[model samples]
Target chain A: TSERTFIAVKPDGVQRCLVGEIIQRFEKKGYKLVALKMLQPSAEQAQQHYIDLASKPFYKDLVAYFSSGPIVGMVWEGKGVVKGGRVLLGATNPADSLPGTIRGDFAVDVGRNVCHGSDSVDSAKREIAFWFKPEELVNWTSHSVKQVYE
Target chain B: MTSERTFIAVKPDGVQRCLVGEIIQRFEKKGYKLVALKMLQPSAEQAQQHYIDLASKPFYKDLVAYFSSGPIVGMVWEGKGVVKGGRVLLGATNPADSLPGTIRGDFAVDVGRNVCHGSDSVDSAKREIAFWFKPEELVNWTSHSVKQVYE
Candidate 1:
């Protein structure tokens, strides 16, 4: 079954020009890009996004970091994309991430880990709604879809 | 001065090779903001206008035909000196002459399949951007990084 996952090139990733390189990974992996936009998150939005971490002591800094620069937000679709996207992003801590994954290849520190991907299908649904309007998502067909899917 | 804009297109061969993100990344890394983007298979007329300067050349017809053959990813990028800056990033028109670090040098081998196009001058950039995209299609967002990119 097809599923959607929300992926974001975090501020550090955008600052480093990894947005294209990150998107290319998913594109090459045969995922469909359904939404994309660039924005600087407000403190409120950032806080809300990481609300699950509200109880943590570092929550304030996390929100501040996210709002510090522009971010490229996206939604990608594919079978098992919730897990697949997480694998592509690697561990939240680049030190724990494997080589060839986005964080592994491009990042070095935990706070500067280059991107965000939903941890589960449920989180994907919630995050997708948090950042994008339905009209903003594109539904175009890729010419290579036939070869990519089966 | 406000940053200038340049028009870029991923030629059909580049699109088919899934090189769009790679090309866009180079410009983004250089601090240009993408103001417009879309994919379209150009009509013969559109392609002809795009290469109007080459209309008198012997290969004009083939140029237009190939341009209109497949989906071309069109983009408008804005930044200081982007017209000239974009051209340098693209390297020489002939991949053979392009240096190793440029988009053409790394990704292209044949002149016919050079993979991407960038505006030749600011005037050309304006005309090209207008030709491919409507005024409304160009977003006016500013990148916070602009402060770091330029004084």
Candidate 2:
């Protein structure tokens, strides 16, 4: 199915200047970027976003770090992108990420893993809605679609 | 000293070729801060206004046509001497004349289809930025890396 996923370059990625590089990977993979912006989210916003992990011990730190600096938030749409985007991001922990993946190539710490992606299609839909308003997402048709799909 | 801002756009050709991220990376790596960014298809009027200075040139018609052809990524990059620095990164207007290591030199070849645009001067930067972006669109935040990029 053609689907959309929410991807974010976390504060560490922004601070480390990896925003462009991260975006480049998806663009090269032929995913269409529908929405994008930079923002310093408040703790309340971050907490609501990661509420699924509220019971986890690292949840507080996750919320704080997400709010600490600017993050580049994006919505990428394409067939199978929910799963494909996760592969592009690699493992949640940089140490376990493969050599060619985003986290593998750019990060070392689990806490500062450099990027975030929705875990599943359902979550992807929820995350996309949480992060962007309807108008914030653009709906232009890209000329590359022919080459990207059969 | 106040940091200066320059407007840059990855023309429709560049967007189709997927050069946006590579272009943004070049400036970000050079220590410039990305203050604003978005993608949109420009109207014929907006494209004409942008290249209004070149309106007298023989190729102005085709220029605006190619520019308004598709979606283009518009941006504002801020930092010390970023206008001049950004130009240096973009290389010469003609990719044929641009040296290696510059954006045009590496990624483009034709002048009419040159993949990107950078403000020609600080004055023009103000004009170009005002033409394409509103004050609220520009993000105001520190890139803590500034401590490492400058004194």
Candidate 3:
């Protein structure tokens, strides 16, 4: 089965002009960027997206920061191996991540964390549908470079 | 000041492999003039002479075979004063030891299978350009905005 995932760069990342750099890293790693957009998430949408963590102490803070400014949302597609997206994202905390990991190297503060990736396959499907409509995704082809990813 | 010309090729590995745009982008971004270019396969004799200086070396035979293996994207780059500008773009001959940001450092792994090449001298450049492209094939376009970027 082909698996799709959702990811986002939060407000702080947008303010710092890291949207392109973050997207480029994913592209260079051979992930197909199926859908992408920059938008300000409504308060209700942010709350629902983080609904599972509602009872947690940082839930309100997460939603407030997420909805503070423009956030870049995306859907990435790849083969059916669970944890593939999570592996690319590294640990939830940047301090524990390895040097080459996305968060471990580029990020320092938890309050202004750089990005997000779907934590599980089921969450991936739900988040992808929530963040992206059918028409917003892109379909493209590759030639010789196709061999590298396969 | 005498300007020097160098023949550089983003090899088939670099072209068909989708690094053509990236390689060209690096050279253009570095303010080098891409004066001549063509897609062609070097003949056996041409390949031999191109590496003539290395003929007596142990790696000579392998160098010729590698050049003739597939069609290469050949070009001549012109820069002010020194031919070493080409070397700077290419990094060291061994790709494994090159830095991460360089063409060799980022894209290539083996010395024999390096992704690109550049002429070592002005004389070699003239000879290689004649071998790979016709005189009329080179373009002539002047950018009035040159002063905005270069002195």
Candidate 4:
């Protein structure tokens, strides 16, 4: 299936002005930016989003940090996009990732990692729903049409 | 010093590939005003004169050809000592030699494909600005966020 994925720039990344840089990299690689916005996530929303991890020790801390500041959330569409975005985001641990990968190159700490991408197609769908409603995703012709499809 | 304006362009390679935003964001983040911008292919005369100073150099022909080959996003930026500030963001002429923080250093791979351009001097800046943009194209405004990023 043609892939749709969800990705987000965490609070620290937004504060650092890495939004355009991250978006540009994705766009350059042929992703269609479907939905995008910058907003502060509410504590209740964060807790519900990570509810599956509630039994884990780090759950509370994760929810607190996720809801602490503003973040740019987005849904992107393209072929092979779910896995492709994970490759772009790099390994979960920055140290285990390579320099050219997004996490290894830009993030140094787990708590302050620069960005996040869904781990699977199901997660992509779940995250997309969590972060955006139907009206928020934009559909328009992009200048890269020839390069991306042809 | 008179507030000076200079012409810079992100070539088609940069624009088509979506690097234009990051390239522009860097300048915006550096406290430069976006005075003028448009996508256009340079005319033969314009392209020739743009690189006229490099006419005697070995790479002149290639530079002209590459620039004139596609639609470029041209711009004018205004500021005090803008020429030097532009160079700092562009890094070295050779992308490989540029530092990691500079635009060229971070994203480009070769001199031929360096992602962006900047005016080299006051005179060149004036000439290039006039050659490509009209006075009204420049935006005159101050960004209060400047203090957070640049000195």
Candidate 5:
């Protein structure tokens, strides 16, 4: 019940009006939405967060695109959320994603693939810390806590 | 501008997991109109007819028990190419096979706990929609879409 993950419906996804569609998928799967906001991230924030992925080769385009439009940033919490959230997002490239995954169904090109989910739990914590102040997270213990675990 | 209808269900596990609102919200967000919806404990006869093709499988009996175990949220979604689109949204029958951003991929641990269901094809969608919903139950409500996803 403690693991958490970070996800963002990219500018493409937000422009296409898929923020709710994306959030709804996680809800359907039974994860708790701890924090959410829609904002156009600055280049510094984008570059800092992508320190792992945005290399000399990738950094320019990645930061530019991230700064191009508003992203719906979110933090989801549940057991195993780190890995599970990425699986739901599909492969990084749309061509590699299967038809059942999020990017698989809606995206086609490398430039805009619907969304981005953290690669690992370590990155999840890092991203969560970057995006959300401690107070932004919510505490919605299940209405029927007994229903979740035996 | 065009419209189509497809059948979907949040299986017993989904209902127990409290994903009905979450499930409905997906359709609503995807610009799909809710044509019909209800929550009911499915009958074995209904389950048999629905899963007739899977009846030969070893898990059919277990599947039957699962459907009848608790109330399931069943629905019809209306949109262009909804049958195929809904299946994509529902993800693979096996959650392990499901991709992230899709319903099955997100929360389900295995095939059994796969949170929800969607008609696999147009023919099955029509049959299932008819099987679960009576004529009057299939509502005809008009909802405007601010954006059109497909031409």
Candidate 6:
């Protein structure tokens, strides 16, 4: 189950003080942390990161959200992780989500969902590459390698 | 626009690991307010009733042994959609397949060690909330960030 994906605590998540909670969620799930950092993305960086959404109606707002404040960017490795990450957060709309998802627990509206995750393996690769170079990733095994892997 | 609640319990293993604060901190950080919380040792009957659906499963007895083994931290979290929010933090049922960033995924290695239990739905949340706590036992208050979160 060791594949990699990108996850970030959005500005609202940061503003609301969920950084440790977010990290704890993944750490408790047995996902390996390959890389992590905090930075206030520039508008250009946000735009570039969301380049594929250029035609979407809310692209500008999406970009603004990313640049609004500091975000906790993280890379986690595990099997089925790309889909798994989305499940963890649930739907962007809390009203539409099941009771056991991120949005379901913490949010009411869709406009300010608390986090973002790479949607697919391909996107994971692209996003990781976009935000960080290979050397930036730490390739060490987790302390729980023995228990984590079969 | 500003109302909802969920019930959650960190079972024996989670308590033994001293993750109560860590677990509570997650809900608190997510902007949900904790209405009631306590540490109690459960009787087998209560545990069995709670997991009645698991009675058909072969692992039911094992679950009983674990659930009754130690004290659990029971809690109520309130917010607009906290039931799902609490569950999201819990991870999948099986820790092995749970996503890494989720509580179960990060800490739980298997079903036997999954850290907590959550109400399956809002209805379930209400039932369990009452089961574990009394009306006077809970104190409901608004959070400082409540305005910023919903608006």
DockQ of each: 0.24, 0.54, 0.05, 0.09, 0.23, 0.17
Question: For this target, which candidate reaches the highest lDDT against the unseen true structure?
Answer: 2
Q: Write the per-residue lDDT of candidate 2 for residues A48-85, one digit (tens) a residue.
A: 87776644578888899889877888888999998999
By summed lDDT, which 10 consecutive residues of candidate 2 chain A come out lowest?
A49-58
| After superposition, candidate 1 runs with Cα above 4 Å error | B9-16, B29-80, B91-117, B123-151
- lDDT per residue as tens, model 4, B10-109: 7756755567657766875666655565546666777888778888977888788877766566777666677888888888988989999998888899
Runs in model 6 lying further than 4 Å from the true structure: A1-108, A114-150
Candidate 1 local lDDT, A52-87, one digit each (tens): 764556878989999986777888888899899999
Q: Residue A60, candidate 2: how far off, in angstroms?
A: 4.0
Best of the two (1, 5) by TM-score? 1
Model 2 root mean square deviation, Cα atoms: 2.3
> lDDT, candidate 5, residue A145?
31
Task: Write model 6 residue lDDT over B55-137, tens digit each, in one string.
Answer: 99988898888898889999988887678767877778888777765678768887878888889898999899888889998
For candidate 4, the per-residue lDDT at B81 reads 73
Across A1-150, the per-residue lDDT of candidate 5 in tens digits comes to 778899999899999988888888787666778899999999998788676563656666877887888999999876667777777777889999876568878899877888988888888888889888989998788553333322
Ranking by TM-score: 2, 1, 6, 5, 4, 3
Restricting to chain A, the TM-score for each candidate equals: 0.95, 0.95, 0.87, 0.90, 0.91, 0.89
- After superposition, the stretches of candidate 5 with alpha carbons farther than 4 Å from their true spots are A52-57, A144-150, B1-12, B15-107, B110-151
| Candidate maximizing DockQ | 2
* lDDT for predicted candidate 5 compared with the true structure: 0.80
Q: Provide fnat values for all models in the order shown.
A: 0.30, 0.45, 0.03, 0.17, 0.40, 0.23
**lDDT (10s digit) by residue, model 4, range A6-118:** 88888777555566677777877888666655556789988876677635568788888888766667677888899999998888888878788778778888778889898
Stretches of candidate 3 above 4 Å error? A80-82, B1-15, B18-151
- Model 2 share of native interface contacts: 0.45
TM-score of 2: 0.90
The positional error of residue A1 in candidate 5, measured at the CA in angstroms, is 1.6
